[PDB]
Amino acid sequence: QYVRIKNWGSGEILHDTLHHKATSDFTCKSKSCLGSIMNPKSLTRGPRDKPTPLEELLPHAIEFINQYYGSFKEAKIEEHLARLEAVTKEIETTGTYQLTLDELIFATKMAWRNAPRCIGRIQWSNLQVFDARNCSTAQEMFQHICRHILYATNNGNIRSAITVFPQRSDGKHDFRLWNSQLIRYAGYQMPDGTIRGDAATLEFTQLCIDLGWKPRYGRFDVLPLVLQADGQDPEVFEIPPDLVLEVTMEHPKYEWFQELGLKWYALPAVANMLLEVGGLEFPACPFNGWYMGTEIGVRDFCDTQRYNILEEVGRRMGLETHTLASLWKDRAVTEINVAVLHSFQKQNVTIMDHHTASESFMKHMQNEYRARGGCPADWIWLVPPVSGSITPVFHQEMLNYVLSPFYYYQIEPWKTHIW
Amino acid sequence: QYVRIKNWGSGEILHDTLHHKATSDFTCKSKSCLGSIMNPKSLTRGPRDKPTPLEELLPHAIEFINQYYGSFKEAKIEEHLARLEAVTKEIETTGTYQLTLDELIFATKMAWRNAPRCIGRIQWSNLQVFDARNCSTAQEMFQHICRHILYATNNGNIRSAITVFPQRSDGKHDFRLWNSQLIRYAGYQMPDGTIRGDAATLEFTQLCIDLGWKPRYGRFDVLPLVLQADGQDPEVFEIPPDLVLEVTMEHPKYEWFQELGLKWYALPAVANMLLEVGGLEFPACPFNGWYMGTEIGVRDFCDTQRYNILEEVGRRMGLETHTLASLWKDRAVTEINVAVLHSFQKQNVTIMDHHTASESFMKHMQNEYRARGGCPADWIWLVPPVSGSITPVFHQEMLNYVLSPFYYYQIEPWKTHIW
Numbered sequence: 001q002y003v004r005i006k007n008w009g010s011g012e013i014l015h016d017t018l019h020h021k022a023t024s025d026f027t028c029k030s031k032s033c034l035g036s037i038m039n040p041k042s043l044t045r046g047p048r049d050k051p052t053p054l055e056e057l058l059p060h061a062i063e064f065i066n067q068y069y070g071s072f073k074e075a076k077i078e079e080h081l082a083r084l085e086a087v088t089k090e091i092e093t094t095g096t097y098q099l100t101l102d103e104l105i106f107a108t109k110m111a112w113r114n115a116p117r118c119i120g121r122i123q124w125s126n127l128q129v130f131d132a133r134n135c136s137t138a139q140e141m142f143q144h145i146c147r148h149i150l151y152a153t154n155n156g157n158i159r160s161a162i163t164v165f166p167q168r169s170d171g172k173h174d175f176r177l178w179n180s181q182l183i184r185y186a187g188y189q190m191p192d193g194t195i196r197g198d199a200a201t202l203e204f205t206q207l208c209i210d211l212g213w214k215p216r217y218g219r220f221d222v223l224p225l226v227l228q229a230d231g232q233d234p235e236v237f238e239i240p241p242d243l244v245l246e247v248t249m250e251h252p253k254y255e256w257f258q259e260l261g262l263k264w265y266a267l268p269a270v271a272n273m274l275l276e277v278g279g280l281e282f283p284a285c286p287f288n289g290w291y292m293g294t295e296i297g298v299r300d301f302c303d304t305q306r307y308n309i310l311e312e313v314g315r316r317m318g319l320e321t322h323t324l325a326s327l328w329k330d331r332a333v334t335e336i337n338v339a340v341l342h343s344f345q346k347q348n349v350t351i352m353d354h355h356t357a358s359e360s361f362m363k364h365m366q367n368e369y370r371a372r373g374g375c376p377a378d379w380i381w382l383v384p385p386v387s388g389s390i391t392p393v394f395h396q397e398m399l400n401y402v403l404s405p406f407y408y409y410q411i412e413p414w415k416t417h418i419w
Numbered sequence: 420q421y422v423r424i425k426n427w428g429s430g431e432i433l434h435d436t437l438h439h440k441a442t443s444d445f446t447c448k449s450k451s452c453l454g455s456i457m458n459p460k461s462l463t464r465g466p467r468d469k470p471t472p473l474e475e476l477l478p479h480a481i482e483f484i485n486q487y488y489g490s491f492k493e494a495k496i497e498e499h500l501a502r503l504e505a506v507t508k509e510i511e512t513t514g515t516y517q518l519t520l521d522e523l524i525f526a527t528k529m530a531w532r533n534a535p536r537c538i539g540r541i542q543w544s545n546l547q548v549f550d551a552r553n554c555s556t557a558q559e560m561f562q563h564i565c566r567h568i569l570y571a572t573n574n575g576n577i578r579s580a581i582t583v584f585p586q587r588s589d590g591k592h593d594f595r596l597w598n599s600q601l602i603r604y605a606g607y608q609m610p611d612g613t614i615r616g617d618a619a620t621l622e623f624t625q626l627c628i629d630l631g632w633k634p635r636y637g638r639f640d641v642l643p644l645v646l647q648a649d650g651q652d653p654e655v656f657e658i659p660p661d662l663v664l665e666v667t668m669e670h671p672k673y674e675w676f677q678e679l680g681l682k683w684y685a686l687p688a689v690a691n692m693l694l695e696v697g698g699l700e701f702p703a704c705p706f707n708g709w710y711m712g713t714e715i716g717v718r719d720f721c722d723t724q725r726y727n728i729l730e731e732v733g734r735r736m737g738l739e740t741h742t743l744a745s746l747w748k749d750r751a752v753t754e755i756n757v758a759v760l761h762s763f764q765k766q767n768v769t770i771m772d773h774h775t776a777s778e779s780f781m782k783h784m785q786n787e788y789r790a791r792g793g794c795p796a797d798w799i800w801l802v803p804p805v806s807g808s809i810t811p812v813f814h815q816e817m818l819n820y821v822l823s824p825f826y827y828y829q830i831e832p833w834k835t836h837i838w
């Protein structure tokens with residue numbers, strides 16, 4: 001039956017039945033809870049050595065095809081049954097199968113719809129799908145990505161999109177983007193122990209250098225694309241500068257803000273996740289949506305492990321930077337968030353504030369429970385890194401489980417690659 | 420073995436072995452996660468009808484006695500073995516047993532030390548224990564509580580303390596405080612649909628009225644003590660006003676802040692939890708520590724389901740109160756937090772800001788892993804309702820499990836009481 005779920009802000013009660021359709025075991029044990037683990041094996045889908053067993057594949061394929069045709073208003077049994085038969089024959093004859101374009105589209109949106117850590121899921125149906133399942137070379141990958149970045153950016157009017165490269169076969173010819181995001185700044189560990197740029201890309205940045213890339217040693221040096229096609233070693237490609245849209249940071253009151261020399265890319269695109277559907281796994285499917293202010297303002301700029309600009313902004317605000325109890329951090333981070341939002345709007349780059357994001361997600365979660373009696377949600381990721389209880393999602397109890405289709409994490413390509 | 424746990428702010432890794440000592444099953448399933456549930460049955464310890472089975476009691480009692488004597492630097496096998504024998508005889512002869520004062524003290528501090536939702540646990544060893552296991556009447560309960568409130572308040576220099584009433588026997592003669600907190604404001608649903616006071620005490624407040632208490636219908640009317648002794652019906656007692664220390668709210672810049680007419684009690688004391696130790700359950704053991712700013716500033720004052728004063732403060736700050744994306748809520752809530760801290764310090768009432776609290780907890784969590792290879796922690800409760808990622812605990816992965824001794828929740832007394 002259903003798990004009773006409550007919203008303490010409204011007192012509203014919901015019944016989750018959808019959690020029944022969950023697959024394998026999640027992160028938490030029978031007597032313990034590992035919900036605050038960032039990368040649990042339950043959310044990861046690693047390497048392959050041989051094809052996936054027919055006994056396993058077929059059952060999943062049937063289920064997905066059933067899910068697909070099931071999502072239709074006005075059924076099509078005929079086509080449905082015909083498709084079931086066709087897929088079976090294909091698995092029998094080929095050892096796998098191919099999704100129709102419409103099923104891929106459906107699958108990409110469902111996997112998004114089933115992403116528990118995503119707060120923008122109310123947009124799940126508005127998604128552009130670029131079919132690159134035909135791709136054969138890295139150069140071709142590079143071309144597909146450039147087309148993706150260009151379409152997505154749309155001169156600042158960001159559009160959600162995903163590019164689907166070839167599915168995994170024997171797992172010995174994997175298409176993979178060694179990048180965590182299509183566009184990201186490099187991090188360099190200076191000779192003086194210092195760190196210039198984004199400390200989070202330190203390892204990858206060093207990899208790019210090892211792959212022959214030339215380090216510019218700047219705080220905001222966009223990293224190269226490191227593409228691996230058909231199991232082949234990775235080839236490094238520079239992204240055409242004209243394609244990378246950026247926003248320079250400035251505050252609508254503090255004119256000294258510009259003097260910080262801050263900026264960020266406008267396109268947030270996850271590059272290293274794997275799409276799972278009907279038995280199939282796509283280890284290469286970069287997708288993107290648009291930014292939520294706090295991602296840049298709070299995390300990227302203020303994380304102690306990222307740009308860490310919070311004390312500097314505090315000093316320039318003339319705050320009691322040495323009195324933790326003065327709440328100067330609360331003050332600074334809020335002004336940084338205003339700079340980030342204001343700067344995007346000014347330059348006409350689509351962005352969304354955390355309050356608005358939280359509010360729309362609640363609307364979505366309600367549609368979901370009403371539509372399919374549930375919505376997989378990770379409270380720990382869905383609550384903004386600032387203003388927690390000030391947002392409605394904080395007061396909402398939720399269930400986190402892995403359905404299918406789904407976007408999994410993967411093991412760092414350079415850790416599991418036979419050069 | 421150990422569960423590897425990481426802190427993404429420092430990159431530091433920890434090994435949790437302590438989770439091994441966990442008892443029953445927690446909240447989360449094998450394929451689902453219910454970590455965001457406020458009141459899971461795994462954290463609740465309900466009513467009793469008959470004594471607790473000797474087969475169950477004895478094993479737990481032995482374990483606790485072993486834990487107790489084990490916590491000693493320089494062992495005392497002799498006394499240890501002697502105590503094991505004495506407790507056994509007692510269970511055999513009486514059908515239960517009594518803890519020595521020192522074991523009760525030890526047990527109250529361990530149960531605190533084992534509270535995953537508590538951020539002040541670095542103070543776990545500094546706790547005053549008032550032994551009221553001899554109490555027989557409500558009047559006596561009322562006297563013990565008054566003594567507790569007086570000792571704890573200490574004219575503003577708050578001291579942590581707990582009062583332990585008689586343990587449960589057959590569960591048909593339970594000592595219980597029908598209150599959620601020793602000191603709390605009443606909530607009244609006005610005739611006009613409105614709500615005056617604290618909306619969170621609406622039901623209880625109505626109960627008090629039903630028990631003959633006279634409603635003053637004010638925004639800050641301290642509620643009466645509703646004590647139930649030896650299974651007897653609850654008797655209502657007014658708390659001596661002189662004993663309830665309060666702080667009037669005022670901002671160190673906005674002089675209009677006082678015009679809001681806000682104030683809060685200085686003593687946060689949980690009244691309705693149950694202490695569990697060596698097979699024994701104490702359904703009545705009010706305890707207290709001191710406030711952390713955000714509890715009042717963010718939750719009590721700004722929760723939409725509490726006093727909900729956030730838009731009013733926003734208007735009086737002249738903020739774009741109708742433009743959610745302006746981040747006015749971030750601005751107001753921060754000033755309210757400054758009012759709350761400033762007002763407590765001004766009136767010399769012990770209080771702690773969330774930044775300082777988060778920092779000390781990290782120090783504690785480190786002592787714990789180093790001391791006993793673990794620390795049960797609920798990330799969802801331990802992260803402040805504001806400034807999330809700005810605090811170190813947000814970047815710390817943690818394991819949540821129920822050890823013993825432990826402070827459990829209980830079912831609302833008025834739901835399970837034979838009048």
Ligand code: HEM
Nearest residue numbers: 112115117118119120123160161287288289290291292407
């Ligand atoms: C259109 C607006 C969108 C917004 C505003 C949005 C917002 C977010 C945010 C705030 C995160 C948190 C990232 C972090 O904290 O590191 C996230 C994660 C995620 N989103 Fe969305 N999202 C959007 C679109 C998408 C799209 C188009 C997809 C996929 C087709 C998607 C899939 C996911 C997944 C899988 C994660 C998890 C990433 C991870 O675990 O690192 N999102 N999203």
Ligand code: HEM
Nearest residue numbers: 531534536537538539542579580706707708709710711826
């Ligand atoms: C001395 C300083 C203390 C501080 C600053 C502190 C702080 C906190 C805070 C912030 C909460 C959150 C309450 C909420 O959000 O509703 C909490 C919960 C809790 N604390 Fe502590 N605490 C302190 C002392 C104590 C003491 C003395 C005990 C017990 C002997 C204790 C046991 C617990 C327990 C069981 C909870 C859970 C309450 C619930 O689930 O509603 N704390 N504490």
Ligand SMILES: C[C@H](O)[C@H](O)[C@H]1CNc2nc(N)[nH]c(=O)c2N1
Nearest residue numbers: 036037038380381813814815816
């Ligand atoms: C340890 C903890 O799980 C980790 O810091 C999480 C918390 N919540 C988060 N939420 C989002 N959206 N993104 C993150 O990176 C994190 N980090």
Ligand SMILES: C[C@H](O)[C@H](O)[C@H]1CNc2nc(N)[nH]c(=O)c2N1
Nearest residue numbers: 394395396397455456457799800
């Ligand atoms: C739904 C969710 O569990 C609930 O709102 C929690 C979140 N974290 C919390 N954390 C603390 N300290 N106190 C609370 O009351 C809550 N409420």
Ligand SMILES: CCCNC(=[NH2+])NCCC[C@H](N)C(=O)O
Nearest residue numbers: 268269270287288289290295296
């Ligand atoms: C990839 C689609 C979802 N994208 C998104 N809203 N942001 C999450 C990734 C960007 C990352 N949080 C950053 O600020 O660097």
Ligand SMILES: CCCNC(=[NH2+])NCCC[C@H](N)C(=O)O
Nearest residue numbers: 687688689706707708709714715
């Ligand atoms: C009871 C000991 C722990 N107390 C404490 N620090 N606060 C939690 C209870 C008070 C509650 N959060 C309130 O602001 O109304």
Ligand SMILES: [Zn+2]
Nearest residue numbers: 028033447452
């Ligand atoms: Zn869990």
